[PDB]
Amino acid sequence: PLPKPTLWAEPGSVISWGNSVTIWCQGTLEAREYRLDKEESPAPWDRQNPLEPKNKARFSIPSMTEDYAGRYRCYYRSPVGWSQPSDPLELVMTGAYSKPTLSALPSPLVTSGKSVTLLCQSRSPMDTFLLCKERAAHPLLCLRSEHGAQQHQAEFPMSPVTSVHGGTYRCFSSHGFSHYLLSHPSDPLELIVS
């Protein structure tokens, strides 16, 4: 088997509508041709006669839209044949829906040891809500509230609240059936612990 190439995105896998992202696939110097499949799209989604140095291929997305969110796999051909496919790359878009609101009950000012509930609310019916703290770069990996029935809010109970929980939070809403399409992030909520 010809070993799979490596795939990544710059700046990364979470891109706001209208912003730029580049998908990079790196095989070897023996690569004669790179191809990218997008999940659920006709194959191949794109292709490149590498050059480049034939070491890597660049797939540019100048202006992100919902048509680009989802997963991608890269495979390449050398004189020997076709490679195994790369691990899939998830490309998440924010801005598919209006921003939700994020608030703290009873207050974002919390006494250490007590509890608080963060409330994320959406105008559009949503079944998935994600609560992310500062420095969380991958919203899909954040605390998640999933529901069968559509909702207009999700609660994130936090207990106990201590110094470590202090910081800035944002929430996102989505539908689980299109989980790579997120709302705009909510305005930031600063949790202040005393």
Curated annotation (Swiss-Prot):
Detected on monocytes, macrophages, dendritic cells, natural killer cells and B-cells (at protein level). Expressed in the lung. Changing residue 159 to A: No significant change in APOE-mediated activation of LILRB4. Changing residue 162 to A: No significant change in APOE-mediated activation of LILRB4. It comes from the Eukaryota. The record marks 11, 82, 97 as: Required for APOE-mediated activation of LILRB4. Changing residue 146 to A: No significant change in APOE-mediated activation of LILRB4. Changing residue 89 to A: No significant change in APOE-mediated activation of LILRB4. Changing residue 41 to A: No significant change in APOE-mediated activation of LILRB4. Interacts with PTPN6. This is Leukocyte immunoglobulin-like receptor subfamily B member 4. It comes from Homo sapiens. The gene is LILRB4.
